[PDB]
DNA sequence: ATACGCGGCCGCCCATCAGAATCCCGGTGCCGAGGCCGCTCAATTGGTCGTAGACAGCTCTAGCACCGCTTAAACGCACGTACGCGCT
């Protein structure tokens, strides 16, 4: 059949995650994909951009990192790094 | 010819039976998590090669600092004109 495949699956728990019998329209979920994809190429296409300035050749979490901070105002920011940065080293603790 | 009787009418308080209306309990429809699921094609898994890019060495630009002769530019104040802004 057609594709057209979206982050419906991500954005619903999430919002289980803070109000779990709280409801949403289907208009409201569109809006989210569309928001999601939106700030996905603002932040990949930034990494890319420094990638290739500075000279090398492969983008790695760290420019994520470098991009995220300038690209957003000073509070969420941090909170935002923090969140980051952990995750990650979690997941390297596993292996 | 002349006087007595009364008759239903009626206001009265006093009695009976149905209807209206509030409270004690209600069914109904709409919304939003849930479950079920299934054919499947995109991620994951185990694996090879090679190449970017980390890293250490190196040298070799240019960013800093610093100074003093020179002076243009900033400063602060004095005076009034011609606008900001208030009213009608």
Redesign the pocket.
Same mark, same amino acid.
């Given at each position: 059949k057609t594709?057209k495949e979206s982050y419906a699956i991500y954005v619903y728990k999430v919002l289980?995650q803070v109000h779990?019998? =709280?409801?949403?329209s289907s208009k409201a979920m569109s809006i989210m994909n569309s928001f999601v994809n939106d700030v996905f190429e603002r932040i990949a296409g930034e990494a890319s951009r420094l990638?290739h300035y500075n000279k090398?050749?492969?983008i =790695?979490s760290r420019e994520i990192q470098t991009a995220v901070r300038l690209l957003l105002p000073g509070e969420l920011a941090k909170h935002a790094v923090s969140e980051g940065t952990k995750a990650v080293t979690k997941y390297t603790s596993a292996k």
């Open positions: 594709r289980k779990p019998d =709280t409801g949403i990638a090398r050749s492969t =790695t």
